[PDB]
Amino acid sequence: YTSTETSHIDQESYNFFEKYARLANIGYCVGPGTKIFKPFNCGLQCAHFPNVELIEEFHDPRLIFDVSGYLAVDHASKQIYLVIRGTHSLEDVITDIRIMQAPLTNFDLAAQISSTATCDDCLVHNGFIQSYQNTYNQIGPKLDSVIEQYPDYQIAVTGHSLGGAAALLFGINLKVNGHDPLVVTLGQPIVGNAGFANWVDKLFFGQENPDVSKVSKDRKLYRITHRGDIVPQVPFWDGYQHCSGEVFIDWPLIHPPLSNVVMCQGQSNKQCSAGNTLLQQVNVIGNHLQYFVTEGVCG
Numbered sequence: 001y002t003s004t005e006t007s008h009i010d011q012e013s014y015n016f017f018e019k020y021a022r023l024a025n026i027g028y029c030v031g032p033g034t035k036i037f038k039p040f041n042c043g044l045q046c047a048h049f050p051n052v053e054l055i056e057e058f059h060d061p062r063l064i065f066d067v068s069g070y071l072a073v074d075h076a077s078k079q080i081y082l083v084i085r086g087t088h089s090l091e092d093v094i095t096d097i098r099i100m101q102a103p104l105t106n107f108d109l110a111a112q113i114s115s116t117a118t119c120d121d122c123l124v125h126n127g128f129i130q131s132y133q134n135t136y137n138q139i140g141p142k143l144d145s146v147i148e149q150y151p152d153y154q155i156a157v158t159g160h161s162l163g164g165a166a167a168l169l170f171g172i173n174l175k176v177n178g179h180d181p182l183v184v185t186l187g188q189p190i191v192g193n194a195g196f197a198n199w200v201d202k203l204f205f206g207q208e209n210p211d212v213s214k215v216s217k218d219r220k221l222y223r224i225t226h227r228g229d230i231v232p233q234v235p236f237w238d239g240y241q242h243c244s245g246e247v248f249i250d251w252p253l254i255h256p257p258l259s260n261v262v263m264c265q266g267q268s269n270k271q272c273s274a275g276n277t278l279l280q281q282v283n284v285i286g287n288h289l290q291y292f293v294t295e296g297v298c299g
Contacts, residue, residue, distance in 0.1 A: 001209050001266055001267050001268070002266050002267065002268045002269070002270075002274075003264075003265040003266035003269060004265075004269060004270050004271045005213070005264075005265040005266075005271075006248070006262040006263065006264055006265070006269070006271050006272065007213045007214065007262060007263040007265075008259065008262065008263075009215060009258070009261050009262070009263060010215065011258055012215075013215040013261075014258055014261055016215065017184070017222070017224060017247060017261065017292060018292040018293065019048075020156070020158045020184035020186070020222075020224075021160075021186055021224070021291045021292040021293050021295070022045065022048055022049075022292075022293055023049070023081055023083055023156075023158050024083055024085070024158045024159055024160040024163065024164075024184070024186050024291075024295065025045065025160065025291075025293050025294075025295050025296070025297070025298065026042055026045060026046060026049075026070070026083060026298060027068065027069045027070060027083040027084065027085035027159065027160070027163060027298075028085060028295075028296055028297060028298040029042040029043075029057075029298035029299065030057045030058070030059050030068045030069055030070055030085065031059065031068060031087070032059070032061075034298065034299075035057065036054050036057050036070055037054075038053075038054055039052065039053045039054060040052040040053065040054050040072065042298055042299050043298065043299020044299070045298055045299055046299075049074070050076075051074055051075045051076035051077070052072050052073065052074050052075070052081070053072060053073045053075065054070060054071075054072045055070075055071045055072055055073060055142065055146055056070065056071045056139070056142055057069070057070040057071075058070070058071075058138040058139055059087055060087060060134055060137075060138060061087045061088070063130060063134070064088055064092065064093065064096055064127070065086070065127040065128065065130040065131045065134070065162070066086075066087045066088070066130075066131070066134050067084055067085065067086060067087060067131055067134045067135050067138065067162075067163065067166055068085050068086070068087040069082070069083045069084040069085050069135075069139075069159070069163065070082075070083050071083075071139055071142060071143055071146065073146070073150060073153065078150075078152065078153050078154065079153055079154050079155070079156050080143070080146055080147065080150055080153050080154070080155045080156070081156050081158070082139065082143060082155070082156070082157045082158070082167075082170065083158050083159060083163070084131075084135055084157070084158070084159035084163040084164075084166040084167045084170065085159055085160060085161070085162070085163035086131070086161055086162030086163055086166075090161055090285060090288060090289075090296055091285060093161065093162050094161070094230075094231060094234070094284065094285070094288065096127075097127070097162075097189055097231075097234050097235065098230070098234050098235075102125050102126075102127070102235035102237055102240065103125075103126045104123040104124060104125060104126065104192065104193055104239055104240075105123065105124065105126045105129060106118070106120070106122060106123055106124075107122045107123065107124045107129070107169075107172075107192070107196060108122070109129060110124075110129050110132055110133055110169070110173075111133060111136050111137075111140070112136065112140070112173050112177060113172075113173060113176060117176040118176075118199065119195055119196075119199045120195075121193065121194075121195030121196075122192065122193075122195050122196045122199045123192050123193040123195055123196055123239075124169070124191055124192040124193075124196055125165070125189075125190075125191060125192065125235065125240075128162075128165040128166065128169060128189075128191055129169070131162060131165060131166040131169070132166050132169035132170055132173070134166075135166050135169075135170050136170070136173070143155075147179070154180070154181075154182060155174055155179055155180070155181040155182065156181065156182040156184070157170050157171045157174070157181050157182065157183050157184075158183075158184045158185070158186070159185060159186070159188070160185075160186040160187055160188075160291065160295045160296070161186075161187050161188070161189075161231060161288065161295075161296075162189070164185035164186055164187060164188025164189075164223075165185075165188050165189055165191050167183060167184070167185050167188070168183060168185055168188060168191055168200075168223075168243075169191065171183030171221070172200060172203060175203055175204070175220070176203070180220065181220065182220050183204075183220060183221050183222065184222045184224065185222070185223050185224060186224040186291045186295065187224070187225065187226065187229050187231045187232060187288050187291060187295070188223060188231070188232060189231050189232060189234045189235065190232070190233070190234065190235055190240040190241065190242050191242075191243075192240070192241070193239050193240065193241055194241045196241075196243070197241040197242060197243045197267055198243075200221070200243035201243050201244050201267075204219075204220055204221040204243075205221070205244060205245070209244075209266070210244050210245065211265070212244045212245020212246070212263065212264070212265060212266075213245075213263050213265055214263065215263070221243070221244075221245065222245070222247050223242070223243070223245065223246050223247060224246075224247045224248075224249065224291055225246050225247065225248050225249070225264075225272060225273035226248070226249040226251075226273075226287060226288075226290050226291055227248075227249060227250055227251060227252060227276070227280055227287070228252070228276060228280040228281060228282075228283060228286075228287035229273070229276070229287045229288050229290075230276065230281055230284055230287070230288070231288050232273045233273060233274065233276060241267055241268075242267050242268065243267060244265075244266060244267055245263070245264065245265070246263075246264035246266075246269060246272050246273060247261065247262075247263060247264070248261070248262045248263075248264050248269075248271075248272040248273060249261055249290070249291065249292070250262055250272075251290075252290070253290055254289075254290045254291075254292060254293060254294050255292065255293075256292065
């Protein structure tokens with residue numbers, strides 16, 4: 001639940017987190033005035049992904065919690081990528097969440113999730129539920145058909161900021177529906193309550209208070225947090241609780257040293273995201289962008 005134990009990582013584990021940071025950052029070409037061109041052209045950021053075919057990019061701007069992103073296939077790594085991101089600017093989204101009522105509602109309210117799947121006390125931020133709903137409404141069917149077209153391809157869901165919260169929720173939806181997804185989130189805010197947090201921990205790790213110390217070959221959930229980023233501590237409300245397991249960038253900038261990317265134990269950790277202080281909490285946006293690569297920008 002709350003520990004202070006941290007663990008160092010491999011260069012392979014580092015490259016794995018940076019890969020998903022890059023893929024999550026690519027989601028920012030999907031907005032207006034920019035686009036990802038087929039097969040996968042978005043400036044030389046997409047160049048790190050030479051074996052990727054873009055299926056469909058999507059965007060909905062009518063609600064603050066509305067989502068944009070892309071669906072793509074990786075022919076080399078044999079994977080289906082679902083990258084989610086909040087349509088609206090990081091500032092308008094961060095401030096709304098940061099300085100507002102964060103009302104919780106039961107998760108089985110959302111599409112493709114029923115009472116048998118979730119616990120009764122599995123409560124989630126109502127806004128993030130709309131973020132998840134918007135994702136499905138825009139890409140659920142297309143993804144289901146792509147899953148049929150590539151049945152041996154592993155599904156990987158990623159997102160930064162609000163997109164991270166939507167990636168976690170979409171990730172649980174696939175996990176619960178007989179699929180086996182990889183969920184990598186970057187700077188994701190707190191999604192639900194203790195009931196949701198402990199349910200996700202059982203879903204992805206098999207038990208409560210799990211051992212989330214090692215990058216396993218079989219591990220499917222990763223929550224990437226950074227020094228000074230206030231977003232993974234938002235909402236500040238007591239009802240909100242993170243699931244395990246945190247991956248912490250204990251470095252002020254992008255491209256951190258291998259030694260400064262740590263594996264955090266527990267749902268809250270004083271040595272990691274939970275220990276963020278006032279002075280490390282000055283560059284609200286600045287700190288939210290630094291996840292291996294500077295997030296929120298695409299060629």
